[PDB]
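Dissemination and training. As part of the outreach component of the grant, students in the summer workshop were shown how a complex can be specified as a set of sequence lines and then modelled as a single object. The example used during the hands-on session is reproduced here so that future cohorts can follow it. Participants entered these lines:
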Amino acid sequence: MLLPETRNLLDLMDAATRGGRPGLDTLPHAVGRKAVDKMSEDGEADPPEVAEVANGGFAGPASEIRFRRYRPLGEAAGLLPTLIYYHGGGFVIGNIETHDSTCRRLANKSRCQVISIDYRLAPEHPFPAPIDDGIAAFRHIRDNAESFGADAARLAVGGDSAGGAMAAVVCQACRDAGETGPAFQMLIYPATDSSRESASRVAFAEGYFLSKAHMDWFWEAYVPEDTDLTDLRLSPLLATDFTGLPPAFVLTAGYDPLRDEGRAYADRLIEAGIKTTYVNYPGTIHGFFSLTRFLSQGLKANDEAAAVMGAHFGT
Amino acid sequence: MLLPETRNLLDLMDAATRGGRPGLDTLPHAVGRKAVDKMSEDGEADPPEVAEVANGGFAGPASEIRFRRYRPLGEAAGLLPTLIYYHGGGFVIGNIETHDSTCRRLANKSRCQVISIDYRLAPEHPFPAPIDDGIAAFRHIRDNAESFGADAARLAVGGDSAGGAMAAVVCQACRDAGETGPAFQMLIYPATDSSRESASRVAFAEGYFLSKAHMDWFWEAYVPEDTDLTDLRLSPLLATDFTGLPPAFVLTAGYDPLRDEGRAYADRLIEAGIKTTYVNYPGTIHGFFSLTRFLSQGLKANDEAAAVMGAHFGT
Ligand SMILES: [Mg+2]
Ligand SMILES: [Mg+2]
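and obtained this result:
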C-alpha cells in the first residue's frame, strides 16, 4: 500500500531507532522540542526564493505573537490574497522555521502572500492558549489587513495537523462569535475529533505512532485533566451546524490515523452546502506535507493546496 | 438552492422569449444542433489568447476524427504535459467551437497543452460510436505523442458532462484492454450511471430546463432500444474494480441531477486507493464550466481544474 519513498523513509526512521538514542517520550518537552524541531527544519525541501520575507510581532492575548510574511515571486500588487498559516507539531513543537520552506513554496505556487504564525506552545502554555493565539492572529491581521499588505476580501487560514485543527477552529470561532471569518480554509490532514477513536485511529493504535501510547507526551502537555473532550476547540467535527463556514481544501494522507476524521470533516462541509475540495494522497504518511526532503508527494501536495487556494482567489 | 449569479442567468433566460416557445428540442440534428451549438459558443467567455492554435485530423475507426491543439502562453518546451479534452452535449450536440474559450483558459492556467476532440455525434452515430471515437483519439495521441508535441508520460483525459463520462470510460477501457492509460482524469460533472436514478436525479423527476420527455429524446438519439444500461461504457460507476485507474479530479455542480453519481464515482476512486480530488460547487447548474460569459463560478472551476492538473504534472 505504501509508496517506495514512504517505505524508504520509514526504514530510515527504523534505522535511527536502532542507533540507541533515547525516545522522544523520555525527554523533557523543551529538550525534545529543540531536537525534533532541528530534524523538522532539515526534513523540509531546500527553501525556494520568494520576493521578500518579513519578520515582526504584535500583542497577542497574553504575549507577543511573532509572524513571518512571505511575498510570492513575481507578484507586484500592493494588497495580496493572503494565507494565515499555523504550523503543526501537536501544539507542543514546530515553529516558523520548521515549515519555512513549505510556506515559501505555498506563496510562490499560489501567488498568495503567506503569513506563518508563531503561537504559544504546550506544555508551557496548554489548551486553550495555542488556539487563543491562533484566533487572535487572524482577528489582528483581518482588522489590520492593509498593514500586512493583505486583501481583506481574500484572507485564508490554514495549517497542517494541529495547525489544521487550529485553522478549522478559527473559522468556527469567528462564525459562532458573529464576526467576519476567513474567506477560505486550507486543512492539511487536520485533527478534528478528540472525543472518539475512528477506525483509522484504531488501525495505527494497534500500531506504532511513536510506539502507540507516546501520543501522551503531546496530549498530556496540552490538555488539562477533566477538559470536556467534546469541546469544539478540541473536536471541531462535533459542531451542530457547518453552514456559514468558509470554502475549504481538505487533504488526508492514506496511511494516517487522522485520515477518517479529516474526510469526515470534508463530508460535513459538503453536506452543509459549502464549496469543498477534498483530496486523499494514498500510500503516504502523516507529516508528508512538510517532510518534502524525503517525500516528493509532499511537494505535489504543496502545489495542489496552493493551486486550489490561488484558483479560489483568482490569482 | 442557487447562487445570485445563477439566478441572474435564469432571469435572463426567462426574460428572453416572453412568447416564442423556443425551449423545445425535437430536432437537434442539423439546425436544432446548429442553433444550440451557436448559443453554447456565445455562452462561453471571450477566448483568451494562447501561444498557438492548430487544427488537424486523423483516421478514426469509422471516420476522420478532428482535433484542435492549444499551446499555453509562456511554455517554450517542445513536449508538454497534455490534456485530451472531450466536449459535453449529451453525445448529440457540442463541438470544438462550443468549448473553445474553455480549452484556451484550461491550457493557460494549467501550463499544459489541450487537445480538444471532435468525436462522432448521435443520432447520426449512436452508442457506442462517440465512445469508440474518444477511445481511438486517446490511443492515437498516446501512440503518436511526439507528433502532437505531447509528453507521453503526462497525458491526461478530461471532459464535461457526456465528455466527463467519455474520459472516465477511456480510462477504464485502457485498463480493461491491458494497455497504458491516461496519467490523469479530469471529470467535470460527469454522467456515470445510466442504470439507476440517484437521489439527485430523482429530485428532478419533472425535468431539468428540458422536461423529462424532452430529455428522453436526447437519450434515445444516443442509445439504441434494448441496450444494456449496465454496459460500463454507459455506466462506468458500475465497474466492479476501480484499482489501476489514474489520479482524478472530479467536480460536481450543486444544483444538478448528475451531482450524486459524480460524487459516487470519486468515492469509488478514493476507496480503491486512487489519488482523487473531489469538489462540489454549490448553487450552480450543470453546464456552468463552459457558460463563462454569464457565470464567474465557471471561470473559478476552470481555474481549479487546470491548477490541480498542473500541480499533478509539476508545471
Ligand atoms: Mg529551513
Ligand atoms: Mg468562441
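The interface with chain A takes residues 1, 109, 254, 263, 270, 273-283, 300, 303-304, 306-308, 310-312, 314 of chain B (CB under 8 Å). Students were then asked to discuss how this feature might be tested experimentally.
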